[PDB]
Ligand binder design. Structure first.
Ligand SMILES: Nc1ncnc2c1ncn2[C@@H]1O[C@H](COP(=O)(O)OP(=O)(O)NP(=O)(O)O)[C@@H](O)[C@H]1O
Ligand SMILES: Nc1ncnc2c1ncn2[C@@H]1O[C@H](COP(=O)(O)OP(=O)(O)NP(=O)(O)O)[C@@H](O)[C@H]1O
Ligand code: SF4
Ligand code: SF4
Ligand SMILES: [Mg+2]
Ligand SMILES: [Mg+2]
Ligand SMILES: [Mg+2]
Ligand SMILES: [Mg+2]
Ligand SMILES: [Mg+2]
Ligand SMILES: [Mg+2]
Ligand SMILES: [Mg+2]
Ligand SMILES: [Mg+2]
Ligand SMILES: [Mg+2]
Ligand SMILES: [Mg+2]
Ligand SMILES: [Mg+2]
Ligand SMILES: [Mg+2]
Ligand SMILES: [Mg+2]
Lengths: 178, 241, 97, 582
RNA sequence: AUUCCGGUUGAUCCUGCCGGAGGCCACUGCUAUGGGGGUCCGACUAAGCCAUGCGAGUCAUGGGGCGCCUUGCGCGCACCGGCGGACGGCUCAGUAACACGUCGGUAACCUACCCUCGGGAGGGGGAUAACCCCGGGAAACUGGGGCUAAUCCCCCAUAGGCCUGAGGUACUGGAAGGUCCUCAGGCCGAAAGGGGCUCUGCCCGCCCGAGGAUGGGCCGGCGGCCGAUUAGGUAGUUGGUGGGGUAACGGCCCACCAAGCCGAAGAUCGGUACGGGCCAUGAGAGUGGGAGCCCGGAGAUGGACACUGAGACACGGGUCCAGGCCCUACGGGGCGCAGCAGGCGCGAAACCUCCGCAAUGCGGGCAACCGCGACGGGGGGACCCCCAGUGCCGUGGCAACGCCACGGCUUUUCCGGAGUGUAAAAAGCUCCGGGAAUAAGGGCUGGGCAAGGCCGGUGGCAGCCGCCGCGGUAAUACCGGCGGCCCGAGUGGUGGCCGCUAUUAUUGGGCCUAAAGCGUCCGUAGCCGGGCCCGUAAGUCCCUGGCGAAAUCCCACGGCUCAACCGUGGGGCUUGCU
């Protein structure tokens, strides 16, 4: 009767709702996602945050206070909330905020990639460093403290400013919503 | 089925060992010895995991057979030997001594100490037989046994503690179980907690007696008398935590 | 190659210095045990007859390998304590047939 | 192809309601796969040509009388080697077993020599296409996952110093000079020449030269060469050919005393020496000239009895419809020839050979019989004595068999005769069919099995209509059913032509089966060959066996002969009674 | 996401069932690039049968020998002797039971190895392997004679052990048929002062006693399926007296006394089933499952019985029956894979007859070390899970969501190589070189249900259709092309469980007409019960002590690039019991 590793993403209750399909199609094009699986993964992350917040609203002390503090400091660390935040703000959060904390998206920002799809390729081909560490997982959620340490790899041609694609990417220095 | 157990699976191991339960399949099954399985850990784990003088059991066994680790002043060459609560693990080549004591989490740890205290071992008396020759055998919680005479048989009582000079086994400083006695808990919920005794309740039949204990910060908590280990009259005098 | 030591702890029971170190190999492959050993004896004037390298492990996306080496006070302790496969790897021993 | 079989001991057609036929899909769909019969006691019979397996009958029969068996097929496997796009294929190889001695029993034409060459590195498998000219690499890559992978890895990395005694002793004879002593001292690397001599009884021939050697003397030499050579793997392809009973016993003893921590593989057709000499024996089954599959290990006595019964009870294969049987049953005179070839005096003590009766020739390995046949064919002329009537149409077949002709079998038999292949002939429908050469007509001869070749030479020799046939070592390289078939062929042709035949061999089964008289050679091997008048069968057998002090016991219900251990109760009884070979 | 949608009519509202839509498990079609992690892989049918090999050995510091080193030192070999082989490993047949879980008990018991303490090791004697001579027997196996030792065996005494009787009351305990002291009568009755060194001391050892520990045995309270178309069951059965037996209490067994015990709150019987921790599902309540990891139990073809040992009624030991198979010289002998691999067979339904003791551990050993199909390492496999790939950038064009061309880039993956990695290897990791090459399907396309007023073929045929329903010459519903939608290295089909289902309803359903109020009354158990006062404090609530293993679950923090995974800590879980 043992453990049996379970999925960390939830699929929708109905597969063919026009509203959900349209919404997800838009998100997937905006954020350049390969998989509904990937999207639903981040949705499930959010859902678990929300459920914890709910429980801790409807909870009592000495524990469920610890977990309140832990939830809030985790979300601060991830960059989803400010330090002065609350469970009300958890419930205000969105999957878009999560996807904005992906690495692919921050690299489309930080003017490093010119396109989320090219950001994906840079990550996967090994041209992005986070705190000196090569990361190749574009779904990696960046911490708000690691965000300012994102850079091309030292062993990357894109780190040579003479590189053609680097020159194009910096011909278009842009950021903001991603 | 047909007989005794010669093995132990690392998941089925004691909860008080600091063992890394999922890394391998097997654990050292302790030999019968001084203490119990609930209040002990094997010397291999002490030499290899706790102190880190070996990454491997072959190295540890070489060490133990060379004779570099004492347990209460005696060389112990077996890697399955039980090392228990309030035991002194000495390494002279390094000049280190450790007291095996429990943690607040309930697990066994090594508290560093020096030579003076390292020549001391407190022993809860835990029983008292009358043996042939009309002599008194004190039956102590490390499974040890001390013979005394019908003269001080009354100075010696069951829940008391005896400080013992261990490479020689000479009693010094009987510490009685009374009110005001400084105490160190060894098991339960209030594990690595200490204070002065306040009260004792008796509970008619085989229900164990209970002691009410006052900590340093004035708090006041109960536990079992058998789990209440006396370390001093008014001060622990054995450098506990 | 650049060696940068992290920890150097003695073990009088077995008789060996245990060295944990970083090998920075920016731009190059992870170095060979021979070259690491040479640089290590230089960085620390050790007896290469007794120095034995346990591991050099390179990680994902780092070009900073992590190594564990051992420096015995006596070759006899080395041959007694240390296993034959490690000795063969460092080349102290030609496998005995 | 799985079909059903009935036990007929558990079958009770009365107390059954005939659930088998009733719950058969084929009978229900109209066909016939199970049906009653008066060929048996009103009991059912199963027609394999229609049964599809499926076991309904098995689990409907209340008295669990029906079982499913397996019939072999040229369909399913991972073919290891194909010689030719339509010639022959092989499924599986046996693994050579670090320290044990492995036997490989099989039949004629099924893949023994082929297995051995694959394991010896002589040839590469070429799993599918005979073409594709790829060896060593892709073979290893394809055998990945197995233990034979390790074997071949070492073999192709030449980490083992394999030897190989080959099936064609004359093709080996051609490639060595000197005499035995310097041959052996030159080839030795283990220092056991004395032991080898004492075992294989090579004292007399210790100074004779290789070219003038008898068949079995030469065999002993090659076997000794192989033994003395140091290696990790030791392959012996039919090391019992041209030998006599005692010498092949000694040979087995030598092999299993001197090779005791080596991989050893042994192909041999002699069940006696395989019972001895083998720890395990793989069986090779299939259809001769078509396909061969290897079996499981099958310890010697079990493997033998299984090979004899058909069935192998680990693959659940019925490899033969029926069992081996072990059946039971003047025109020229001369003077007492004396002959002398440098040494080896020979005296024969004349006979009569009435009509077409068969004359066997028995004796040790090293006295006459081949000199004698050579004299009769006239290759050698006697120091004294001669045959009468001389100058008679003659044929011959020596023991110098090896592949020499470059044409095909149809040409061979053509230039031999017309009766060899004219289906007009009783000769054809008796010999060439029962020998199954119609399945080898379009096969070149230099690529044949030892037994197919032997059958061919015998066919030619008996197709050449004559008055004096002479066949030496005809049973060599042959299995047991073929031994008996060949014997029946000889007897048939000889009694049809009313001629003489002089069969030399070391197979008392053959001599007992056909020989209506025999001739025994006595004397010191290689020094003196003293034959005698033709003697009746049992007497000559008993004398030939009283010499060499060997004894045989035949099972009654089958007839399988087996040698009795020296000193055994039955040896002593059969000796003190004089009933050698009962 | 605490959800709905389609279907009874000419239309409507209901009831109600079917279906869709979700997840998981197993088989399965088509398809398939990579890596990592993990408690996955002959469990479902056959606890059916098994070819081969391996899975338990170790000690030369117990003993005498045989051999090799020219001998010394030393090396090897078996044999006797010890220790172990009763663990581990596999399977789930049987079992509805103190088997399991949990709380407790044993003052009613055993325990080799281990620890502590306290003591002791005295005096004799003997045999027999190995070896030597001869063998027998097909084998399996086995005989006779000679010779020899021991940490082998026997004896004697001293200690000690057990019983009984008397009395003293020193010990512990909650409580003495216990321990202890003295005395009586008895029975049983040890030991290796052995071996090795740096030898006058040390090490490893032998026996007894007291305790402990370890591992078990036994007892009890509570707790957990179905059936009344199973209602009476039990005869040593319930109890007692006295015994025997057992390690130990016990109708466990016996002799003699009595008539009890269980049961409608369901006994007995039958059916099914290893139990649990856990798992799946679901908003939860709940429903369901209980192969894989741990704990316990049981079993080793079925059945029955014993020896030896601390421990077995003994998976790799013994005996018999039944049943089957193998070898045989027909006299006899041997085997039962539910160990790892591998096969047969069964089936819809599951891998290699690999490598290594390097880790973890076990046993042996003074130790070094040796062995271990445990374990580890690999490989095979659309087992689960995590991370990714099948290109990206510009310009220009298009039937512009995307494609095509022209130029540029990168190289995760592919190819090759070097180092590290590894027990060795492989993978992985770092680096070099080459090059957009080397890499996308499956289903659907009338509505449920996202997506075609397109085309060609067939023409109530063929076919589809989960349900509704389409199809009889203009078919968006079959087949095909083009297109499009969903998911995507996966996607579909079949079966099963949960959900849907407030179609089992405690939460939370209904019973005039839809399924459903006994024909009516009376009453036993059961359940529900007016108001005040007093008490108790059983339920109930609070607080506190001891327990309810670990893993699993939640959370944070750390380490493998992140993750999965692992560790640290906090919490929860176990129905709870006390
Ligand atoms: N080089 C070859 N080329 C083509 N066919 C061959 C070759 N060698 C053998 N064959 C055929 O393959 C079949 C079996 O091969 P082979 O291994 O030689 O038989 P075998 O087992 O040795 N029988 P035998 O020697 O008679 O005991 C024979 O019938 C040959 O005709
Ligand atoms: N040319 C020759 N010169 C001298 N001696 C010869 C010659 N040929 C044969 N011999 C010897 O004659 C003796 C018998 O010869 P041969 O008849 O060929 O052997 P065999 O008895 O048939 N044994 P086998 O063929 O193995 O069954 C052997 O010792 C030969 O060495
Ligand atoms: S096999 Fe069975 S069904 Fe057929 S005849 Fe025999 S008993 Fe009847
Ligand atoms: S197996 Fe089936 S088809 Fe063949 S004979 Fe038996 S019942 Fe007929
Ligand atoms: Mg051949
Ligand atoms: Mg000859
Ligand atoms: Mg509707
Ligand atoms: Mg099975
Ligand atoms: Mg299983
Ligand atoms: Mg005595
Ligand atoms: Mg069952
Ligand atoms: Mg079986
Ligand atoms: Mg499967
Ligand atoms: Mg449709
Ligand atoms: Mg219903
Ligand atoms: Mg209703
Ligand atoms: Mg737990």
């Amino acid at each position: 009767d043992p453990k049996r590793q379970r999925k960390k993403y939830e699929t929708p209750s109905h597969p063919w709702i026009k509203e959900r399909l349209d919404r997800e199609r838009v998100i997937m094009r905006k954020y350049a996602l390969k998989n509904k699986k990937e999207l639903w993964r981040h949705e499930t992350q959010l859902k678990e945050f929300r459920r914890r917040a709910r429980r801790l609203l409807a909870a009592r002390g000495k524990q469920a206070e610890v977990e309140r503090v832990q939830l809030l400091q985790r979300l601060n660390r991830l960059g989803l909330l400010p330090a002065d935040a609350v469970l009300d703000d958890v419930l205000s959060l969105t999957v878009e905020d999560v996807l904005d904390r992906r690495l692919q998206t921050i690299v489309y920002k930080k003017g490093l990639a010119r396109t989320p799809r090219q950001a994906r390729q840079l990550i996967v081909h090994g041209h992005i460093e986070v705190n000196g560490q090569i990361i190749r997982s574009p779904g990696y959620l960046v911490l708000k403290a690691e965000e300012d340490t994102i850079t091309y790899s030292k062993t990357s041609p894109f780190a040579r400013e003479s590189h053609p694609e680097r020159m194009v990417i910096e011909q278009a220095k842009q950021g903001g919503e991603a | 089925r047909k007989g005794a157990k010669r093995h132990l699976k690392r998941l089925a191991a004691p909860d008080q060992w600091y063992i890394s339960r999922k890394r391998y399949k097997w654990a050292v099954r302790p030999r019968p010895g001084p203490h119990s399985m609930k209040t002990s850990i094997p010397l291999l784990y002490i030499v290899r995991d706790y102190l880190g003088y070996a990454k491997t059991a072959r190295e540890a066994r070489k060490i133990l057979n060379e004779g570099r680790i004492l347990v209460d002043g005696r060389v112990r060459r077996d890697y399955k030997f039980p090392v228990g609560i309030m035991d002194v693990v000495s390494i002279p080549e390094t000049g280190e001594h450790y007291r095996v004591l429990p943690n607040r989490i309930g697990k066994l740890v090594l508290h560093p100490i020096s030579e003076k205290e390292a020549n001391i071992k407190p022993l809860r008396i835990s029983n008292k037989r009358m043996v042939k020759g009309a002599k008194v055998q004190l039956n102590l919680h490390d499974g040890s046994n001390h013979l005394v005479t019908v003269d001080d048989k009354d100075n010696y009582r069951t829940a008391y503690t005896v400080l013992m000079k261990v490479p020689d086994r000479e009693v010094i400083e009987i510490l009685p179980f009374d009110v005001g006695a400084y105490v160190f808990v060894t098991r339960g919920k209030n594990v690595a907690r200490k204070g002065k005794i306040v009260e004792v309740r008796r509970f008619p039949m085989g229900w164990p007696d209970v002691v009410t204990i006052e900590d340093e910060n004035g708090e006041l908590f109960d536990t079992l008398k058998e789990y209440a280990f006396v370390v001093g009259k008014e001060k622990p005098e054995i450098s506990l935590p | 190659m650049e060696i940068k030591v992290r920890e150097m702890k003695e073990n009088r029971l077995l008789g060996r210095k245990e060295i944990y170190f970083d090998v920075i190999h920016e731009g190059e492959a992870t170095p060979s045990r021979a070259d690491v050993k040479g640089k290590l004896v230089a960085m620390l004037d050790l007896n290469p007859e007794t120095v034995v390298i346990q591991y050099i492990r390179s990680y994902f996306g780092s070009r900073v390998s992590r190594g564990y080496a051992k420096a015995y006070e006596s070759k006899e302790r080395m041959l007694y304590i240390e296993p034959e496969y490690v000795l063969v790897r460092d080349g102290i021993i030609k496998k005995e047939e | 192809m799985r079909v059903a079989v009935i036990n007929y001991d558990f079958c009770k057609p009365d107390k059954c309601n005939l659930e088998c036929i009733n719950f058969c899909p084929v009978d229900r769909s109209g066909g016939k796969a199970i049906e009653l019969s008066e060929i048996v006691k009103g009991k059912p019979v199963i027609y394999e040509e229609t049964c599809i397996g499926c076991g309904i009958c098995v689990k409907k029969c209340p008295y669990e009388a029906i079982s499913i068996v397996n019939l072999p097929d040229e369909l399913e496997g991972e073919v290891i080697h194909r010689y030719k796009v339509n010639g022959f294929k092989l499924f599986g190889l046996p693994t050579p077993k670090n320290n044990t001695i492995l036997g490989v029993l099989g039949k004629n034409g099924v893949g023994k020599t082929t297995v051995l060459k694959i394991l010896a590195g002589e040839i590469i498998p070429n799993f599918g296409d005979p073409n594709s000219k790829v060896g060593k690499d892709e073979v290893l890559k394809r055998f990945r996952g197995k233990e034979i992978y390790n074997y071949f890895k070492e073999l192709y990395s030449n980490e083992l110093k394999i030897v190989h005694k080959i099936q064609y002793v004359e093709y080996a004879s051609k490639f060595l000079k000197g005499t035995v002593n310097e041959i052996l001292t030159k080839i030795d690397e283990r220092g056991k020449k004395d032991e080898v001599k004492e075992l294989l009884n090579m004292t007399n021939l210790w100074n004779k030269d290789a070219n003038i050697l008898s068949g079995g003397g030469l065999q002993r030499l090659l076997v000794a060469a192989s033994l003395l050579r140091e290696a990790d793997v030791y392959i012996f392809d039919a090391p019992s050919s041209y030998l006599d009973v005692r010498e092949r016993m000694n040979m087995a003893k030598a092999i299993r005393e001197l090779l005791k921590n080596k991989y050893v593989i042994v192909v041999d057709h002699d069940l006696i020496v395989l019972d001895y000499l083998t720890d395990l024996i793989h069986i090779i089954y299939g259809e001769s000239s078509v396909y061969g599959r290897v079996s499981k290990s099958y310890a010697a006595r079990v493997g033998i009895n299984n090979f004899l019964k058909g069935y192998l009870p680990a693959e659940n294969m019925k490899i033969r419809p029926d069992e081996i049987k072990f059946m039971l049953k003047t025109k020229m005179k001369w003077t007492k020839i004396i002959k002398k070839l440098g040494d080896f005096q020979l005296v024969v003590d004349n006979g009569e050979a009435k009509e077409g009766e068969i004359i066997g020739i028995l004796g040790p390995n090293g006295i006459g019989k081949t000199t004698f046949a050579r004299i009769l064919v006239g290759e050698i002329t006697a120091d004294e004595g001669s045959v009468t009537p001389e100058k008679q149409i003659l044929s011959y077949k020596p023991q110098r068999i090896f592949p020499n002709y470059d044409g095909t079998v149809q040409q061979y038999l053509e230039n031999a005769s017309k009766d060899a292949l004219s289906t007009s002939s009783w000769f054809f429908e008796e010999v060439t069919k029962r020998l199954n050469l119609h399945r080898l007509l379009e096969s070149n001869v230099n690529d044949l099995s030892g037994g197919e070749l032997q059958k061919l030479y015998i066919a030619a020799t008996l197709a050449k209509e004559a008055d004096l046939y002479v066949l030496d070592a005809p049973s060599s390289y042959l299995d047991v059913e073929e031994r008996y078939i060949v014997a029946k062929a000889i007897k048939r042709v000889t009694r049809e032509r009313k001629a003489v035949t002089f069969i030399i061999d070391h197979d008392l089964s053959i001599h007992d089966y056909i020989a209506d008289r025999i001739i025994v050679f006595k004397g010191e091997p290689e020094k003196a060959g003293l034959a005698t008048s033709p003697v009746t069968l049992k007497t000559g057998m008993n004398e030939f066996l009283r010499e060499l002090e060997v004894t045989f016991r035949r099972d009654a219900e089958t007839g399988r002969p087996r040698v009795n251990k020296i000193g055994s109760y039955l040896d002593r009884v059969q000796k003190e009674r004089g009933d050698y070979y009962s």
